[PDB]
Design a protein around this motif. Structure first.
Motif, PDB file in Angstrom:
ATOM      1  N   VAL B  38     -15.368   3.956   2.698  1.00 49.53           N
ATOM      2  CA  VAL B  38     -13.769   5.393   3.375  1.00 49.53           C
ATOM      3  C   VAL B  38     -12.489   5.088   2.206  1.00 49.53           C
ATOM      4  O   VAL B  38     -11.692   5.888   2.116  1.00 49.53           O
ATOM      5  N   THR B  39     -12.340   3.055   2.442  1.00 50.69           N
ATOM      6  CA  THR B  39     -11.371   2.939   1.606  1.00 50.69           C
ATOM      7  C   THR B  39     -11.777   3.564  -0.410  1.00 50.69           C
ATOM      8  O   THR B  39     -10.166   4.129  -0.479  1.00 50.69           O
ATOM      9  N   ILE B  43      -9.388   6.888  -2.184  1.00 53.73           N
ATOM     10  CA  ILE B  43      -8.862   6.739  -3.219  1.00 53.73           C
ATOM     11  C   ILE B  43      -9.802   7.467  -5.008  1.00 53.73           C
ATOM     12  O   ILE B  43      -8.239   8.363  -5.021  1.00 53.73           O
ATOM     13  N   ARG B  44     -10.444   7.854  -4.420  1.00 57.29           N
ATOM     14  CA  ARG B  44     -10.747   8.991  -4.982  1.00 57.29           C
ATOM     15  C   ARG B  44     -10.261   9.785  -4.771  1.00 57.29           C
ATOM     16  O   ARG B  44     -10.298  11.319  -5.953  1.00 57.29           O
ATOM     17  N   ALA B  45     -10.048  10.618  -3.487  1.00 51.67           N
ATOM     18  CA  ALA B  45      -9.096  11.629  -2.936  1.00 51.67           C
ATOM     19  C   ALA B  45      -8.076  11.756  -3.768  1.00 51.67           C
ATOM     20  O   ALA B  45      -7.342  12.752  -3.949  1.00 51.67           O
TER      21      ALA B  45
END
Lengths: 48, 49
Positions: B38-39, B43-45
């Motif tokens: 999820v982390t 970040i990619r989001a």
């Protein structure tokens, strides 16, 4: 294995190989025999 | 670190209190691995936005 008159010596021991058969482990609990019964790899009641 | 990665194995082998010990290790790691996933997705989001 269990009911043999005299087992093998712990200095030189004979390992009994048991395969291709039916193992009924509920008889142990149905009739109390062993004074010390324990399982490190599994639980004593899950053998059956 | 658990004896086995399969839940059905530890439940069909270890005692009730012993299984809980192994289940703790499996849940702990799987929880950390999911949190890491999820982390990274967050970040990619931020990179795509």
């Amino acid at each position: 294995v269990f009911n043999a008159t005299r087992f093998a010596s712990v200095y030189a021991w004979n390992r009994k190989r048991i395969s291709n058969c039916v193992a009924d482990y509920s008889v142990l609990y149905n009739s109390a025999s062993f004074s010390t019964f324990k399982c490190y790899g599994v639980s004593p009641t899950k053998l059956n | 670190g658990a004896i086995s990665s399969v839940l059905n194995d530890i439940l069909s082998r270890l005692d009730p209190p012993e299984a809980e010990v192994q289940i703790d290790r499996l849940i702990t790691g799987r929880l950390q691995s999911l949190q890491t996933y999820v982390t990274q997705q967050l970040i990619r989001a931020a990179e795509i936005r």
